[PDB]
Amino acid sequence: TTALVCDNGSGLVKAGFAGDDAPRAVFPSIVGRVGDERTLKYPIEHGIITNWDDMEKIWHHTFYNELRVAPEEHPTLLTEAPLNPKANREKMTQIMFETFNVPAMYVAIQAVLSLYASGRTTGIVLDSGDGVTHNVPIYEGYALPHAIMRLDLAGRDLTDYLMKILTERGYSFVTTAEREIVRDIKEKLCYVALDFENEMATAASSSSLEKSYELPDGQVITIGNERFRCPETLFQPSFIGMESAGIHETTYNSIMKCDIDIRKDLYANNVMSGGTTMYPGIADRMQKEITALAPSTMKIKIIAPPERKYSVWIGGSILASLSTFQQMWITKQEYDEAGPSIVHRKC
Amino acid sequence: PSPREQLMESIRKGKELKQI
Ligand SMILES: Nc1ncnc2c1ncn2[C@@H]1O[C@H](COP(=O)(O)OP(=O)(O)OP(=O)(O)O)[C@@H](O)[C@H]1O
Ligand SMILES: C/C1=C/C(=O)O[C@@H]2C[C@@H](CC[C@H](C)/C=C\CC1)O[C@@](O)([C@@H]1CSC(=O)N1)C2
Ligand SMILES: [Ca+2]
Numbered sequence A: 001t002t003a004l005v006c007d008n009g010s011g012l013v014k015a016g017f018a019g020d021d022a023p024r025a026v027f028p029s030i031v032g033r034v035g036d037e038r039t040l041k042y043p044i045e046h047g048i049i050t051n052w053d054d055m056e057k058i059w060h061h062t063f064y065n066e067l068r069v070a071p072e073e074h075p076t077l078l079t080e081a082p083l084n085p086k087a088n089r090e091k092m093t094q095i096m097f098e099t100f101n102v103p104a105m106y107v108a109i110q111a112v113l114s115l116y117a118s119g120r121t122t123g124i125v126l127d128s129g130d131g132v133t134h135n136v137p138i139y140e141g142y143a144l145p146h147a148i149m150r151l152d153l154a155g156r157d158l159t160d161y162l163m164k165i166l167t168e169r170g171y172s173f174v175t176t177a178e179r180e181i182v183r184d185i186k187e188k189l190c191y192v193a194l195d196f197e198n199e200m201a202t203a204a205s206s207s208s209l210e211k212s213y214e215l216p217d218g219q220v221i222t223i224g225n226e227r228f229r230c231p232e233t234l235f236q237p238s239f240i241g242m243e244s245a246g247i248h249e250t251t252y253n254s255i256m257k258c259d260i261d262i263r264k265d266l267y268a269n270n271v272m273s274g275g276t277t278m279y280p281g282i283a284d285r286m287q288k289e290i291t292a293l294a295p296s297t298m299k300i301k302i303i304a305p306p307e308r309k310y311s312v313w314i315g316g317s318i319l320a321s322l323s324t325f326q327q328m329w330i331t332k333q334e335y336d337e338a339g340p341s342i343v344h345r346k347c
Numbered sequence B: 001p002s003p004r005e006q007l008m009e010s011i012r013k014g015k016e017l018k019q020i
Helices: A052-066 A086-099 A110-117 A155-168 A176-189 A196-205 A226-232 A247-256 A260-267 A282-293 A308-320 A332-338 A342-346 B003-013
Strands: A004-008 A012-017 A025-028 A076-080 A104-109 A123-128 A133-139 A149-151 A211-214 A220-223 A270-273
Touching (some): A004 A052, A004 A308, A012 A052, A025 A052, A052 A086, A076 A308, A086 A104, A110 A123, A110 A270, A110 A308, A149 A247, A155 A226, A270 A308, A332 A342
Parallel strands (some): A004 A076
Antiparallel strands (some): A012 A025, A211 A220
């Protein structure tokens, strides 16, 4: 009777019950033992499932340990990355019906669900999490595959670059535990500058931008320009030696792969989602950059609401609890008759 | 309106979610 919603991130699983405002379970997508509880291994790399046995351990941990449910008792909506291979969609569907014996399931694209969380069915999303970033233009709930852009530069890369630019100050962050310390520094202290060159000058001219952080050994480190240099990587991927254009350009390129007839609607409905869009200033920087690239009279709107770390999950919670959605589930009966490729007909 | 079109309309309407 209650549907389950599971957004399986490269870094975090967000899971809970359709109709709720927030996931009840948020835990790391890792096995040594599983989740909150061998190395670590992350079974989702850059948003795509790469270790199916460990993915099954994460799904079992979600149902039994975290949610305290039997998956055979609930319709289950799962999420997937944009451009998820057809074979991966079929493998998830099979696991759910044959291993977990779900009565019904659905798989939705992450970025589509965050568009839905904003009350829209057409728009373009920038979804940036821990392992992957995408630009995803959507027309009436359809993600347009020829126009989707993927960038393997997201939160984990930003933490690794902040580690590198601090290390090059003499503060050495290299280990797994040290990486977690720097991820916390990044979340607490980083921001996106409106004008990177200007901010570089302010940093150097004043201590006004400085913040201090106490490390575990009671060393206190001070960071200045590292606060904005770290996420500036999203706009200048050359900072970590990537040749890709930054995320304002890839937004543009994505728009330009779509018909000119929908472009007004994409520019006026640019939704940001995922943990790596949380930086103070990132919406305003995007609005500035996309205004520079768009036609001169074009209306630009960036929608970056404060709940955006979980908007994929929230859109799933809305979707799976709508009365108009109840005929859209793949039922176990349909899976028994059609097998795993039913997922392509229905999702 | 197709069932898909009613679904898109419901998504645009939005809804209240339960506080956890
Ligand atoms: N306030 C914050 N500022 C900057 N980064 C943040 C903030 N909060 C979380 N993040 C980063 O967001 C990432 C977690 O985001 P999220 O849960 O959206 O990713 P995911 O869905 O697991 O990954 P993906 O969709 O890439 O597979 C981590 O890199 C985390 O450090
Ligand atoms: C609080 C928290 C946040 C997070 O995003 O966690 C996810 C999951 C995590 C798994 C490793 C870890 C030590 C476990 C839990 C930390 C989970 O790795 C990340 O922290 C990584 C390594 S540093 C980074 O930015 N992403 C992202
Ligand atoms: Ca995600």
